[PDB]
Design an enzyme around this catalytic site. Structure first.
Site, PDB file in Angstrom:
ATOM      1  N   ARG A 153      11.779 -42.201 -25.766  1.00 11.75           N
ATOM      2  CA  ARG A 153      11.899 -41.096 -24.851  1.00 11.75           C
ATOM      3  C   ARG A 153      12.102 -41.576 -23.420  1.00 11.75           C
ATOM      4  NH1 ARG A 153       9.035 -39.407 -29.154  1.00 11.75           N
ATOM      5  NH2 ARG A 153       7.437 -40.979 -28.605  1.00 11.75           N
ATOM      6  N   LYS A 181       0.858 -49.447 -30.611  1.00 12.52           N
ATOM      7  CA  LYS A 181       1.919 -48.730 -31.320  1.00 12.52           C
ATOM      8  C   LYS A 181       2.401 -49.381 -32.604  1.00 12.52           C
ATOM      9  CE  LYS A 181       5.055 -46.253 -28.405  1.00 12.52           C
ATOM     10  NZ  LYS A 181       4.080 -45.154 -28.270  1.00 12.52           N
ATOM     11  N   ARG A 218      -6.417 -44.062 -21.140  1.00 12.61           N
ATOM     12  CA  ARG A 218      -6.846 -44.607 -19.858  1.00 12.61           C
ATOM     13  C   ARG A 218      -8.124 -45.385 -20.160  1.00 12.61           C
ATOM     14  NH1 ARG A 218      -8.591 -39.423 -17.298  1.00 12.61           N
ATOM     15  NH2 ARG A 218      -9.291 -40.464 -15.383  1.00 12.61           N
TER      16      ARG A 218
HETATM   17  N1  LIG Z   1       9.345 -52.075 -31.928  1.00 17.67           N
HETATM   18  C1  LIG Z   1       8.412 -51.645 -31.050  1.00 17.67           C
HETATM   19  N2  LIG Z   1       7.019 -51.597 -31.384  1.00 17.67           N
HETATM   20  C2  LIG Z   1       6.040 -51.146 -30.491  1.00 17.67           C
HETATM   21  N3  LIG Z   1       6.433 -50.731 -29.202  1.00 17.67           N
HETATM   22  C3  LIG Z   1       7.800 -50.774 -28.880  1.00 17.67           C
HETATM   23  C4  LIG Z   1       8.766 -51.237 -29.762  1.00 17.67           C
HETATM   24  N4  LIG Z   1       9.994 -51.160 -29.155  1.00 17.67           N
HETATM   25  C5  LIG Z   1       9.819 -50.675 -27.910  1.00 17.67           C
HETATM   26  N5  LIG Z   1       8.480 -50.426 -27.710  1.00 17.67           N
HETATM   27  C6  LIG Z   1       7.802 -49.861 -26.523  1.00 17.67           C
HETATM   28  O1  LIG Z   1       7.858 -48.402 -26.676  1.00 17.67           O
HETATM   29  C7  LIG Z   1       8.039 -47.853 -25.400  1.00 17.67           C
HETATM   30  C8  LIG Z   1       8.356 -46.450 -25.304  1.00 17.67           C
HETATM   31  O2  LIG Z   1       8.602 -45.823 -26.525  1.00 17.67           O
HETATM   32  P1  LIG Z   1       8.538 -44.207 -26.767  1.00 17.67           P
HETATM   33  O3  LIG Z   1       9.544 -43.488 -25.902  1.00 17.67           O
HETATM   34  O4  LIG Z   1       7.100 -43.674 -26.554  1.00 17.67           O
HETATM   35  O5  LIG Z   1       8.874 -44.148 -28.209  1.00 17.67           O
HETATM   36  C9  LIG Z   1       9.107 -43.209 -29.088  1.00 17.67           C
HETATM   37  C10 LIG Z   1       9.567 -43.690 -30.441  1.00 17.67           C
HETATM   38  C11 LIG Z   1      10.746 -44.653 -30.599  1.00 17.67           C
HETATM   39  C12 LIG Z   1      11.686 -44.177 -31.699  1.00 17.67           C
HETATM   40  C13 LIG Z   1      12.227 -45.304 -32.570  1.00 17.67           C
HETATM   41  C14 LIG Z   1      13.057 -44.864 -33.787  1.00 17.67           C
HETATM   42  S1  LIG Z   1      13.832 -46.234 -34.655  1.00 17.67           S
HETATM   43  C15 LIG Z   1      14.649 -45.082 -35.733  1.00 17.67           C
HETATM   44  C16 LIG Z   1      15.170 -44.034 -34.736  1.00 17.67           C
HETATM   45  N6  LIG Z   1      16.439 -44.427 -34.092  1.00 17.67           N
HETATM   46  C17 LIG Z   1      16.290 -44.465 -32.742  1.00 17.67           C
HETATM   47  O6  LIG Z   1      17.204 -44.751 -31.912  1.00 17.67           O
HETATM   48  N7  LIG Z   1      15.004 -44.135 -32.372  1.00 17.67           N
HETATM   49  C18 LIG Z   1      14.201 -43.849 -33.542  1.00 17.67           C
HETATM   50  C19 LIG Z   1       9.033 -48.730 -24.854  1.00 17.67           C
HETATM   51  O7  LIG Z   1       9.491 -48.548 -23.535  1.00 17.67           O
HETATM   52  C20 LIG Z   1       8.438 -50.062 -25.144  1.00 17.67           C
HETATM   53  O8  LIG Z   1       7.548 -50.384 -24.114  1.00 17.67           O
END
Ligand SMILES: Nc1ncnc2c1ncn2[C@@H]1O[C@H](COP(=O)(O)OCCCCC[C@@H]2SC[C@@H]3NC(=O)N[C@@H]32)[C@@H](O)[C@H]1O
Ligand SMILES: Nc1ncnc2c1ncn2[C@@H]1O[C@H](COP(=O)(O)OCCCCC[C@@H]2SC[C@@H]3NC(=O)N[C@@H]32)[C@@H](O)[C@H]1O
Lengths: 317, 318
Positions: B116, B181, B315
């Protein structure tokens, strides 16, 4: 497939005065027969043009063509694109979603693929009505879309009630009625991510100076401001709408639906009447009693009052 | 173009040594050129190390995704397996017109995996599960938040059942284990109030990933493997697809109600101090779970208010 001549033509006739084919054909450099072919394209666009032996070609009433800089000057910042001929003002903004800012608008004289919900068509004859769309970035995401739809309905109803429209009411969750006939259609489209922001495009098609409608596009039953008794400069009315919606949403971001809850009760054109709701394709019936605090329509199907969050309401024949 | 780096990883996937010798022939290229793809693989996040005297190798076997295998554990619905893609969510979003509720796609690698607020999801080749599923909701945009809660609940319940005992959910998307995460969940949608909503659910579940690019992942992270759970990606995908399909059927039909209490037992932040970011506004308070509408209940100075939107996070000092 090419619109410059007929546009230049409507610009000429737009003043409500007679223009003889001889003069038009002179100004435009083509045969009198050719000038009539374009007159015919305007008629296809929904423009009503008559001829009078001796005098020439005329519009029943003048048209006040939209002027971007003219509407801009009645505003507080914001951007406004005024388009002669467009497929859909909504489509126009949806395509420009990444360069947009909240409250940016777009408005057109004529839509060739004006749309509604469920793949339906919205009759959009050239220069007779308001075909306006505005973009909004809802920071509180999709959960807030419906309440947003409700604010818009209440706001437009207000702007028009203050100009002479008495029995102008709202429909849950989109559209304005008057004397029980679609007076304006509102189509809110959006892209968002739950837990993130929602990009919203608000489309409003307000029936103003329209005179005849095409029976097979509009079976429903319609109505116009002109039949209410009002003749608004579209340029004026667009100004007042962008101003008010920009402020009303700014406020809904800050307080939610709360300040609009009572306003909805007075304006619901369907509060307490035999209605019908449509979910996808499965029909469901009942009676109604306003909405709740989260904006859901309250449906009493036999003694019990359950709240539904989706679907299209409508009176039952 | 990469027909080749793929042919190459198909060959290395078993984890056995494959010298620059053997490779060259059953791949029609000069060992200098074949050494050019082994780098494209490193760039895709594969840890290929060469040990002169034995050849190239992967520190650990990769069980490549197999559509036939998955599809054969399901009943209907398309499951597209994509070797290299930009984003599984973008793949489906680009096909909204031809998709039917429950259709899905999985990829080995994402070149533009996303989260996001414009963030990147680190997606190295073949180490994690990158899955998306499409769903058409007749209730429209209002039901999207509820859908997110159901997905988190169901995914958590599955992993707990498969053995990762303390996996929890974050309102309204993402899975946590020990406060780091485990799976990122991204739900995107298009719709119109008063009509249907087309929803694309994206899941990024960390499985065998051993290292991360610190400049993409700066927060805590954790894998199923650390939870002691060692699953086949094809098996888990089939499982998740089957379960999300059944759960969305149930949601479509009965809404959030049947899921409400299951949520309260999986919530990772309930009764803990949190931060709610909305737009550019951080607000602080105590999470108190969710209300029947799925709104987050945030307590600020003795008073509790429901928040329909926003990003939440823990937090705590050190
Ligand atoms: N592999 C990882 N494991 C743990 N932390 C990580 C990883 N990769 C990145 N991050 C951290 O997650 C943060 C934010 O994620 P989010 O917006 O809360 O995230 C919301 C969910 C993300 C969606 C992912 C799936 S993959 C299948 C699908 N395709 C796609 O493009 N997105 C979704 C990133 O800025 C980074 O700091
Ligand atoms: N001019 C009209 N007056 C009264 N009834 C009509 C008119 N045109 C079509 N209809 C009838 O409205 C019905 C249903 O429309 P709706 O989908 O509920 O509709 C929701 C709202 C549609 C929004 C219009 C705006 S114009 C600016 C923006 N751009 C765009 O493409 N759509 C929106 C139509 O199928 C037809 O029977």
């Amino acid at each position: 497939k090419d619109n410059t001549v007929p546009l230049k033509l409507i610009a000429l006739l737009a003043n409500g005065e007679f223009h003889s084919g001889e003069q038009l054909g002179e100004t435009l450099g083509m045969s009198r027969a050719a000038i009539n072919k374009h007159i015919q394209t305007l008629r296809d666009w929904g423009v009503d043009v008559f001829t009078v032996p001796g005098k020439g070609y005329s519009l029943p009433e003048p048209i006040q063509l939209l002027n971007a800089k003219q509407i801009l000057g009645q505003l507080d910042g914001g951007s406004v694109a005024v388009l002669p001929v467009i497929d859909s003002t909504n489509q126009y903004l949806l395509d420009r979603i990444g360069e947009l800012k909240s409250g940016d608008a777009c408005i057109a004289e004529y839509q060739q693929a004006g749309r509604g919900r469920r793949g339906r068509k919205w009759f959009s004859p050239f220069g007779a009505n308001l075909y306006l769309s505005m973009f909004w970035r809802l920071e509180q995401g999709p959960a807030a879309a419906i309440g947003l739809s409700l604010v818009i309905g209440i706001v437009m109803a207000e702007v028009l009630r203050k100009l002479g429209a008495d029995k102008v009411r709202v429909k849950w969750p989109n559209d304005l009625y008057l004397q029980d006939r679609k007076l304006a259609g509102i189509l809110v489209e959006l892209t968002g991510k739950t837990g993130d922001a929602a990009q919203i495009v608000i489309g409003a098609g307000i029936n103003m100076a329209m005179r005849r409608v095409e029976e097979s596009v509009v079976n429903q039953g319609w109505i116009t401001l002109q039949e209410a008794g009002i003749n608004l400069d579209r340029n004026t009315l667009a100004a007042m709408l962008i101003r008010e919606l920009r402020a009303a949403l700014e406020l809904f971001e800050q307080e939610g639906l709360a300040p609009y809850l009572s306003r909805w009760e007075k304006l619901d054109n369907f509060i307490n009447r035999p209605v019908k709701l449509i979910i996808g394709d499965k029909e469901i019936f009942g009676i109604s009693r306003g909405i709740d605090k989260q904006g859901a329509l309250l449906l009493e199907q036999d003694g019990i009052i359950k709240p539904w969050m989706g679907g299209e309401i409508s009176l039952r024949s």
